[PDB]
Amino acid sequence: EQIRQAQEELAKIATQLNENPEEYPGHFKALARIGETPILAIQKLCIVTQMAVYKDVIPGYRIRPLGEKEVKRLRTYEQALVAGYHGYLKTLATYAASSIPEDRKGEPISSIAFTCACELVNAVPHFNFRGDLLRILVKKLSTRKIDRDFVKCREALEKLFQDDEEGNASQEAVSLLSKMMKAREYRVDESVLNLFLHLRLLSKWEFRTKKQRKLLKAEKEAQKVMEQADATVSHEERERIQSEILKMVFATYFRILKARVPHLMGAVLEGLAKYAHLINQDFFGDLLEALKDLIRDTDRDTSRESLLCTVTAFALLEGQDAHNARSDLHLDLSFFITNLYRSLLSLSLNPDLELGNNKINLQTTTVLLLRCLTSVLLPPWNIRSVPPIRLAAFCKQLMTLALQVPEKSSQAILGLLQDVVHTHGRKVAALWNTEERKGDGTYKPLSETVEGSNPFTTTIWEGELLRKHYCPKVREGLKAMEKELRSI
């Protein structure tokens, strides 16, 4: 049919451009004209064919607007390429902005155009109008409707981020993403936020004549001095691009935190915990106090937010560079420890606990509590230097919590306390051997501070109910606890 005529024409054009590109410069327009047909099948095939040639023909560099025989041939070829590629991007934008639904006859023109856009993104980012192509991508992933095109664009941008080693593409993409988030007033689906986590940059004797040999030496020293200069310049430019991208990312994160968007806090906190070691020192301290103020505002949903903030602070402090910076940077987690200790009771009484590679953005409040408890009692660093008063107070409070908290979470708490007894032992054996109960005061349950509540002037008497809890799992967990206490 007319479709067959288009088949032959498109095949001839594509093969001609593959074989001799320079000698045939007008096909780039001829191809736009043959795509101008109103037949949908011909339109789809023209779009995919244009994807294929523009892919193979684009040079490993960008060209300059000339303005103002082989050289003229190249000039003309190059100018036709840019004009045709600009037309291609305009057509892709129009098709993608066009309405998706038609009669069910395979993948629509919108889906095919989106696939083409993803392929161009992943194939030739360096060439011109990367901005327009990424604008198409963002105009798709700014809609809050999960779709196959949505996920496809998502992994396209993800692969671009994880493969960009230069940085300009990353900078343009993050600028577009931040502007989109601000314009949409932070009503996005958190995947565009996880892209920021997915960034990479934030982590035979040939005979030679006498003339040929001297010239070759000349290029040798020229290329040596150029390699040295290029190394230095690339280092400086990579650092500057990192600075710009980090600026944009942290601006987005802090605007989200200030706006208090409930469904993005986990991703924002994950990003902060990931990149605060890449930002300066004074900003690390300021971020700690920002987390403190978030906790205080929640004090004046809320449980999950407080636990997220506590987990982020503790993880940031378990970062290696931050761990060594500790004393010099004056980073004290006493506020977070005290807040967790005081909130344990309300968390125990909260019935919303079990309503639900990653390190922060965890959907379960019980899981967040377990991470906080692991941070406070079983730390990656200085595990055997933890204050015994802190250990004993948290042991008593967690036994009371496990007494008053649902089955599976209680099993988790018993496991954590078993691990604590395994690691420390002799420090906490007095909490169960009543002959070693200190008599230098009385236990204060409803205290205000961990040291204030005398932990060694009391006995863990809860077992007498958690051995008759209804769940065999928690019963056997307590049995294991007593077993290892005995095998101390």
Partner: protein, 110 residues
């Protein structure tokens, strides 16, 4: 198979502009002043239809000299500081480098 987009922004980056900004912010010279010493010999000079070589030669050889202040210099430095300028890793390795340098100096003295 089946083959959200919808006045110039003034940015101070120069130490002289920061010094003059401090002069406005603190009660030293006011608006009436700033216009008054605006009417000087460098004022009412044509810049619109001039060739780039002419304009750049005048720009390089005709920069007015004004006192600058240490506060303004520090302010420009703080403004232009990069966000990854002072990571913990970089400052720690700087301290390690200088400590190694003193150790090597002591051993050379030995």
């Amino acid at each position: 198979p089946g083959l959200w987009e919808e006045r110039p922004n003034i940015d101070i980056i120069t130490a002289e502009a920061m010094t003059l900004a401090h002069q406005l912010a603190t009660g030293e010279k006011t608006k009436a002043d700033l216009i008054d010493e605006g009417y000087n010999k460098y004022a009412f000079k044509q810049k619109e239809g001039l060739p780039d070589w002419f304009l750049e030669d005048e720009a390089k050889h005709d920069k007015p000299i004004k006192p600058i202040t240490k506060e303004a210099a520090q302010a420009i430095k703080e403004k232009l500081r990069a966000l990854n300028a002072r990571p913990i890793k970089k400052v720690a390795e700087a301290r390690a480098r200088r400590k190694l340098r003193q150790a090597k100096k002591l051993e050379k003295l030995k």
